[PDB]
Amino acid sequence: PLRLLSSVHYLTDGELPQLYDYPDDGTWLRANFISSLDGGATVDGTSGAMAGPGDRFVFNLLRELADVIVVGVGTVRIEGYSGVRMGVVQRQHRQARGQSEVPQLAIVTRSGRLDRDMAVFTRTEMAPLVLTTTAVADDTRQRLAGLAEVIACSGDDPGTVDEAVLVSQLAARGLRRILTEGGPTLLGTFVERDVLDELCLTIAPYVVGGLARRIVTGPGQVLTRMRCAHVLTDDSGYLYTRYVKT
Amino acid sequence: PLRLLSSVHYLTDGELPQLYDYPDDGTWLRANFISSLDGGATVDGTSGAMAGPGDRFVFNLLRELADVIVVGVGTVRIEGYSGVRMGVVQRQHRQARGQSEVPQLAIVTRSGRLDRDMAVFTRTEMAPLVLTTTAVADDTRQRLAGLAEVIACSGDDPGTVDEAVLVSQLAARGLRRILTEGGPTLLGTFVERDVLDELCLTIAPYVVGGLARRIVTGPGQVLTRMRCAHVLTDDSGYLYTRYVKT
Ligand SMILES: CC1=Nc2c(nc(N)[nH]c2=O)NC1
Ligand SMILES: CC1=Nc2c(nc(N)[nH]c2=O)NC1
């Protein structure tokens, strides 16, 4: 019943993008996260200490493939999100696939309370979207004039964000290939609301002990079955996994 | 830099034990845990909902290989630990390796506050060890007379358990091949105190959302590097991993 996995194929920068290609059409919400063996998502507030050159390479690839990168306001404040940076060949590849040179960033906030000089607004080639509620969309739009496109993502309830509506709002703007990088509250809502199509997860070969949070937080509790699409590795013992619903 | 993993070898019940063999001599502390993709260790207080036939098989194998199974009093109370059960061929294999027919159970408690009719005491072929502090060892020994061997595992401080001493106390009794199954507080102390030699981790193909705890809890924070020894899989997309310090 059990099979040993081992390295069978060295990947070229030609086949690697193929492994992480989005579907032909339709919207697709992919998450990319890293965590330790004992399930911790941070080493001192951030993920980076666990990320080596392999994970950086995968991380930048997934950004290169995406139409839009969706992130919660907390992770934007804490990981210090600036704009999305794309190098020359990355821009070239994107153009080859019919995409803009650099993917958009979309910042999720229920409150709408964002400030004008954040790096997402300042250190950026392309103005970001702000995904918020019907209730606060107009005021938010007014405060962030010239800095960001503000989009109401409410469903039945004008005072909350409906995550399926959020996804539809991106799709309607031609941004159907979606990548989210967190943080844990937002991922938690995508999981709880069952709109996550795929999770790419880097399993870093460390144990970090009990303090760290998981890659998801919140009161949500589900049991969503995924299919293992692939597992990659490198020389340092990292596992780069891709799982797809259902 | 990246390599695709895939199934290269179907394992027989002859080679599987070889993959998880303990070292020739010296003490070795192995942990076995299961968790979801998003790092959750429980689905409603227990692990079992995530465990399929493959994980049950690995779980029973690791118990078959161990000299002693070490568990915290919390997990004993909550997962409803009875005795360790071994089937006929398992008993045979154990005898072949020079081991007793059924491995001992050792229950860790700083307080020493255990009751006489727990299933570890009642539904058991072999009396368990209770690993506690110098401070409470004598009274605990008196309360549990006839039910358990009580062992003081204090180092410098008679009011605490020193986890390296705990390990030495098992070794001194010929129980050098140690398996721990938790719970999260105990694993947290083994990690924090750096006495964990190996982690076998079943990665279950589910996301569970933000509520669940990790396989480790506590205030501990470390960054302990492990080496990936192997990754197995089955038809259902589970990954059975084995990582070794350092
Ligand atoms: C904030 C954040 N960072 C990372 C991430 N995923 C990977 N692989 N690596 C990362 O470093 N997503 C979340
Ligand atoms: C309480 C507990 N259960 C399990 C475990 N490990 C595996 N693989 N599977 C389990 O079900 N250790 C902790």
UniProtKB/TrEMBL annotation, chains A, B:
Functional pathway: Cofactor biosynthesis; riboflavin biosynthesis
Binding of NADP(+) 1, residues: 34, 41, 45, 73-75, 79, 109-111, 163, 183, 185-186, 189
Record-listed NADPH binding positions: 34, 41, 45, 47, 73-75, 109-111, 163, 183, 185-186, 189, 213
Key words, A-Z: NADP, Nucleotide-binding, Oxidoreductase
Record keyword Nucleotide-binding present: yes
Annotated binding of NADP(+) 2, by residue: V73, G74, T75, T109, R110, S111, E163, G183, T185, L186
GO biological process: riboflavin biosynthetic process
Gene Ontology molecular-function annotations: 5-amino-6-(5-phosphoribosylamino)uracil reductase activity; nucleotide binding
Cellular component GO terms held in the UniProt record: cytosol
InterPro entries linked: DHFR-like_dom_sf, RibDG_C, Riboflavin_Biosynth_HTPR
Pfam entry (one): RibD_C
Chain ranges of the Bacterial bifunctional deaminase-reductase C-terminal domain: 28-239
Protein name as catalogued: Bacterial bifunctional deaminase-reductase C-terminal domain-containing protein
Organism in which the protein naturally occurs: Mycobacterium tuberculosis (strain ATCC 25618 / H37Rv)
Gene: ribD
